[PDB]
Design a protein around this nucleic acid. Structure first.
Ligand SMILES: [K+]
Ligand SMILES: [K+]
Ligand SMILES: [Mg+2]
Ligand SMILES: [Mg+2]
Ligand SMILES: [Mg+2]
Ligand SMILES: [Mg+2]
Ligand SMILES: [Mg+2]
Ligand SMILES: [Mg+2]
Ligand SMILES: [Mg+2]
Ligand SMILES: [Mg+2]
Ligand SMILES: [Mg+2]
Ligand SMILES: [Mg+2]
Ligand SMILES: [Mg+2]
Ligand SMILES: [Mg+2]
Ligand SMILES: [Mg+2]
Ligand SMILES: [Mg+2]
Ligand SMILES: [Mg+2]
Ligand SMILES: [Mg+2]
Ligand SMILES: [Mg+2]
Ligand SMILES: [Mg+2]
Ligand SMILES: [Mg+2]
Ligand SMILES: [Mg+2]
Ligand SMILES: [Mg+2]
Ligand SMILES: [Mg+2]
Ligand SMILES: [Mg+2]
Ligand SMILES: [Mg+2]
Ligand SMILES: [Mg+2]
Ligand SMILES: [Mg+2]
Ligand SMILES: [Mg+2]
Ligand SMILES: [Mg+2]
Ligand SMILES: [Mg+2]
Ligand SMILES: [Mg+2]
Ligand SMILES: [Mg+2]
Lengths: 73, 119, 88, 101
RNA sequence: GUGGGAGAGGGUGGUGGAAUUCCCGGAGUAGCGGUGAAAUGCGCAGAUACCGGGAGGAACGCCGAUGGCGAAGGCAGCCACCUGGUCCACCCGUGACGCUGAGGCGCGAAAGCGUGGGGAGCAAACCGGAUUAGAUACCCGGGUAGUCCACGCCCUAAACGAUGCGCGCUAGGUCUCUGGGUCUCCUGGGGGCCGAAGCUAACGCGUUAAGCGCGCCGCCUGGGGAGUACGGCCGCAAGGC
């Protein structure tokens, strides 16, 4: 189960095809640069598919994290 | 006698043993302990207990260099990993922040048979 | 590929009459077009086997028409072929 | 012609001398391949999420162009030589598909 | 035809970061490793753990699904170019141009064969360590072919939905992917589950039929002998039909 209130909702309207809006994008990664699963992201097969796509681009442009060290264990 | 004060303590949980390494503010080790170091041999080495003392035997060698605070970094899953983390805490040493950094690959090398039915 | 423009030219200079988008004559024309395109595509990428299939489908789709035409209007036929340079 | 976008991240630790020089190379080679400027953005420096080329920071450039497809890749191969050019990413423009509007 | 759509469908070039190994440097001791427990092995020529740098090969974490594409085999990092199929809407052009399909031809996982290149990790065979009554094994340490690429062969399979292709007819409910609409819903295409009628030896099937029908192809006729022998055709061989 997940009781954290999906992303999307806590966000305005944006362009999923934008691989540069770090501030918005960033929002879809876990503590680790991991791309958040729909059960969290809050999008649709179609969105959640265009998201991941652009996220991967930003990463190549070195604007997003491929991975992150998990703080506190 | 180089005096360190603050430092890094890397825990290396394996299912076979638990080396703990202490290093200066940015890499470069100082002292370290294992499971054999302390004394055990076979599967004994991995036992969470060993992991404890191991953290500890590495705790003293640390203070001797003048260690007070430490950034704990854990790697790999394993027995007593938490032990070590738990040790260092009650080691009289300052445990600044625990942080997991196990090396996971974005799938590249074929694993030994032993690690494939799992993959 | 084939810009909306590019394709008209063909139809235009083929449609048996205004608005003729879909007569045997036309169809065969475009088919040919595509076919030729893909063909040169396979002059390279000889290993694009999956595209190669589509070729056959086209080629056959074409014969099924030519065949029709030649059987129905043996003249419209000669006409069409004599224009494209198809079959020899 | 096809509408593209040429993201370029180059060495952050430079100055108006070479930096300018790179544009005086990039901006050229573009037109040498039929590049057509539609709109350029220059967010300049920014902190990369991960260190690229040892350095932990990059200078971002942008160029919405409408060049001849047949030479897109040819355009990237070239733009890449500049040692200060550490990253080149061309990607044909698409309409911005919004969500949660 | 025109106008929109989704997609790991295919070919080519490029490119990204994580990890393994190796080499270089630091810092640093006495072990590491591995197992049920061990040992072989590696380490004072300084290993394991840690830090920075480099080289190389192969595979793309999360996204990822009970999801999508393809005719099948099969297809996942990102980008660009080339290219195939397909769906919806509008009902605009042709005017039965249709369906199936012996032989033919092309495609066809893996292993395997030929030439050349590459070789990090993994690993038939192989060399050892354990185990056991023995161990030509399972466990452990190494390790060659191969695994990777190009080109050319091989053509097999639980190549499976174990279900040939096309069309029409026969309750619905539910979940889902993707398109259109007057968008508590209707409608189209695809992926599931449950079930009407019906079918079925039963299990089960059930608008994604295994139901009611038509057309065309392929195939079956008790086990074993045997997918063997002979013959032919194919293959460099192994072998295949
Ligand atoms: K599937
Ligand atoms: K024979
Ligand atoms: Mg007539
Ligand atoms: Mg020895
Ligand atoms: Mg090498
Ligand atoms: Mg299918
Ligand atoms: Mg399969
Ligand atoms: Mg297409
Ligand atoms: Mg009409
Ligand atoms: Mg008429
Ligand atoms: Mg047929
Ligand atoms: Mg046949
Ligand atoms: Mg092979
Ligand atoms: Mg070979
Ligand atoms: Mg043996
Ligand atoms: Mg026995
Ligand atoms: Mg047995
Ligand atoms: Mg072995
Ligand atoms: Mg090995
Ligand atoms: Mg084959
Ligand atoms: Mg059977
Ligand atoms: Mg249904
Ligand atoms: Mg809708
Ligand atoms: Mg349906
Ligand atoms: Mg029932
Ligand atoms: Mg009944
Ligand atoms: Mg049922
Ligand atoms: Mg008999
Ligand atoms: Mg038999
Ligand atoms: Mg028999
Ligand atoms: Mg046989
Ligand atoms: Mg022979
Ligand atoms: Mg055989």
């Amino acid at each position: 189960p997940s009781r954290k209130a999906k992303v999307k909702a806590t966000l305005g309207e944006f362009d999923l095809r934008d691989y540069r809006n770090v501030e918005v994008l960033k929002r879809f990664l876990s503590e680790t640069g991991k791309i958040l699963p729909r059960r969290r992201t809050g999008l649709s097969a179609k969105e959640q598919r265009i998201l991941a796509k652009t996220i991967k681009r930003a990463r190549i442009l070195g604007l997003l994290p491929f991975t992150e060290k998990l703080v506190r264990k | 006698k180089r005096q360190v004060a603050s430092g890094r303590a890397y825990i290396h949980a394996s299912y076979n043993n638990t080396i703990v390494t202490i290093t200066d503010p940015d890499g470069n080790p100082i002292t370290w302990s294992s499971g054999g170091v302390i004394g055990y041999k076979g599967s004994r080495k991995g036992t969470p207990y060993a992991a404890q003392l191991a953290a500890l035997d590495a705790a003293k060698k640390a203070m001797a260099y003048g260690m007070q605070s430490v950034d704990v970094i854990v790697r790999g899953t394993g027995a007593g990993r938490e032990q070590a983390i738990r040790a260092l805490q009650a080691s009289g040493l300052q445990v600044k922040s625990i942080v997991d950094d196990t090396p996971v690959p974005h799938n590249g090398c074929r694993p030994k048979k032993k690690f494939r039915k799992a993959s | 590929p084939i810009t909306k423009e590019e394709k008209q030219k063909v139809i235009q200079e083929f449609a048996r009459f205004p608005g003729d988008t879909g007569s045997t004559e036309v169809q065969v024309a475009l088919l040919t077009l595509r076919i030729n395109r893909l063909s040169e595509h396979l002059k390279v990428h000889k290993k694009d086997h999956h595209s190669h299939r589509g070729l056959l489908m086209m080629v056959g789709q074409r014969r099924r028409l030519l065949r029709y035409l030649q059987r129905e209007d043996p003249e419209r036929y000669r006409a069409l072929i004599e224009k494209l340079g198809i079959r020899g | 012609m096809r509408r593209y976008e040429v993201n370029i991240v180059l060495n952050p630790n430079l100055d108006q001398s070479q930096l300018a020089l790179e544009k005086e190379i990039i901006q050229r080679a573009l037109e040498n391949y039929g590049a057509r400027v539609e709109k350029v953005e220059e967010l300049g420096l920014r902190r990369l999420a991960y260190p690229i080329a040892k350095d932990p920071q990059g200078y971002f450039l942008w160029y919405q162009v409408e060049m001849p497809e047949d030479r897109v890749n040819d355009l990237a191969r070239e733009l890449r030589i500049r040692d200060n050019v550490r990253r080149v990413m061309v990607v044909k423009s698409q309409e911005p598909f919004l969500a949660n509007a």
